[PDB]
Amino acid sequence: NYNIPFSPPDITEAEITEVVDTLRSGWITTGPKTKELERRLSLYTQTPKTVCLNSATAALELILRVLEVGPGDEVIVPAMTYTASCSVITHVGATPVMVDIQADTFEMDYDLLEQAITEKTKVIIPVELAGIVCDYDRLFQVVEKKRDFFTASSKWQKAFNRIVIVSDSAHALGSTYKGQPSGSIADFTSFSFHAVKNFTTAEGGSATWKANPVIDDEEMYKEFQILSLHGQTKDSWEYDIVTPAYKCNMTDIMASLGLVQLDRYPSLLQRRKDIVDRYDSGFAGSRIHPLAHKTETVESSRHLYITRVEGASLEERNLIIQELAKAGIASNVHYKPLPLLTAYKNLGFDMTNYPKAYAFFENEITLPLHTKLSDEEVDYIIETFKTVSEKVLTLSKK
Amino acid sequence: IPFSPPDITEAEITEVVDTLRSGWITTGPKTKELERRLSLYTQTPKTVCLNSATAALELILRVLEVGPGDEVIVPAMTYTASCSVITHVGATPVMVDIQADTFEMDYDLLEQAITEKTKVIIPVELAGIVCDYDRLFQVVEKKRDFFTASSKWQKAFNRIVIVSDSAHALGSTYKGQPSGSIADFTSFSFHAVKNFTTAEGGSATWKANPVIDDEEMYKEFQILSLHGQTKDALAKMQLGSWEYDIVTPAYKCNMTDIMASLGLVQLDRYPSLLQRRKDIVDRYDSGFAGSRIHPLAHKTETVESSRHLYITRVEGASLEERNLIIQELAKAGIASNVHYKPLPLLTAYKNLGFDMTNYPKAYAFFENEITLPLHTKLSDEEVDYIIETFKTVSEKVLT
């Protein structure tokens, strides 16, 4: 039969050999391969420097720490995102401010974003959900429009003298917006190389920033390095510790996976395109409505096949997932809005303030999208998801 | 001669390859099996394998809910990571000076440093040598009336909790018991340069105690290490187990099966690695006997050290003379190191008000300290060369 997994890893013998090479070398933690991966990633994202770290969460947190966002500052995040986009705000002691999304897309309602901005707002964190990059022209217009609310209180906040926009591009390595690669669009960007992502090092990620005359790239790179490795500096036993910092460097074991993945990535991206186009033609005219991966402004890296089923309640969506599972099709939900989660409910966030986020979630189902899918499996998912959705609704009507 | 190259064989490589061909490249069955095997090795009920010792020590503090207004005692003579985690959770580090003839805290001064705010003591098992736990447990008991619990786990103990920094001490013993089983909680390090390596990694464990439910405690670490994510019984039993909750906005420091693969093989190899380190230490020890080079003892009445660092102090040497000796070792093709600058020498801790003049014993230990290479890629000929060169060089610098 079929037992189609949601997100198995795509590892070949080339990854294994490269990792083996590292394990024979003098360098098994951070070494030359990590530096080479950062160099190649920078060229790929059209940014001057990249800091490879052990997760996207570590990257996003370090961006916030480099910006010195902390107690008394506000950071804006969508109500519809993964917990990790928000949790790093609480880690640095800042106040998350959630903004509701639009009716026909995951993106923040940018009018409501404008309204949420205060004198305390330091950072906006858009999420490039499923690889689809946000309306950056509008986002930059908002921060410029509200520039007079901004009051810098750190080195880097003074340099930019406005709200800094930090892309959560966990899902978006290789996505483009008006022809420009994610990484080059926002002021800072985090990427994720987690086991389930398009590009994987099992655990990993990176921080980068777009070229900007107010940033010395070597100085910025060095500040991340210091925060990722205990605050340690050297001017050969002697070192100093300048701040009691963290431990989130990338190993050459992981960088080895990355280097091979990056060679493979154009082909991987192409396969995902072919699967999305097959799904898209398959769901045309049905109740199954996918998020568009190709728009006038965006070419998505096609990380998640996010769908919403027209007319389906919460209960009905949950039943459909369990029926897909009985048919040998794994599926997922991206995402529970943050206010549904105990941690954020406990911080006073209330789901009734973000009805659009709720309505997106309510009928959302993510189908498998990865490079181990055969065409036959995709065809099977298309036909099954239609038959199952119809069955559940015809059952409800009855 | 390098200071600390990794000792990786084809068995590690094959095990990692096996993982890379499996469905599981991040946290998976190999990580759970490594935790199980490590728990048996350390004689503890459960182990939580994570991405660094620093992660493990932090999480212990976060499980204990040590935070703002609490004090955590650490030695003045330790690595920055023993202390930095205290600041991470927002607690106040309290440093204690060490003894004249060992790295260990002066336990009288430890008693004096205890207040109503003290929640945790972090001894460091320097070079693999385990601290005087009988004395440490006597101190916390003696001062029990200073303690006022302010969290679930603090109430359970109802005293200062003793957390071992065993970064250097996987496989060490104290009165025949393995590090891991001695302190209330223990962190271990599997960093590239440690006796047992996963390139980056570490663990948290805890000794058996009736007031701890081991599965509940294990589950709390898991949750903190992986975003605060939980799933209920109903969600796990369903064929489609997507639904989760986030209970606290937690952290991201889980161990991958890639790293656990290295660990499993290292753990099979570990008795033999430990034996080789013993043989090197004994050779150094006989070599330095009667000289000015005084090594820390790896075998005592109470301790059998895992023999992670060969820490030495050169009698009669000033700061400047020590530094010259290191550079002369380096010209002779011998890498060496210093463990450690006392914390008050470091800008970060200076900046928090810590003053080197308060910890003269820590300074004096550091001043004439040289660490010689101790790892399993050393040949006997290299060890003999280091012995005879270090003696000649020291004599030359002093003459």
Automatic annotation (TrEMBL), chain A:
PTM-bearing positions, type N6-(pyridoxal phosphate)lysine: K197
Pfam families: DegT_DnrJ_EryC1
Organism: Streptococcus pneumoniae serotype 4 (strain ATCC BAA-334 / TIGR4)
Name of the protein this chain belongs to: Capsular polysaccharide biosynthesis protein
Keyword Nucleotide-binding (UniProt): no
Lyase among keywords: no
Gene Ontology terms: biological process: polysaccharide biosynthetic process
Modification N6-(pyridoxal phosphate)lysine (covalent) occurs at: K197
Active site: K197 (proton acceptor)
Gene Ontology molecular function, alphabetical: pyridoxal phosphate binding; transaminase activity
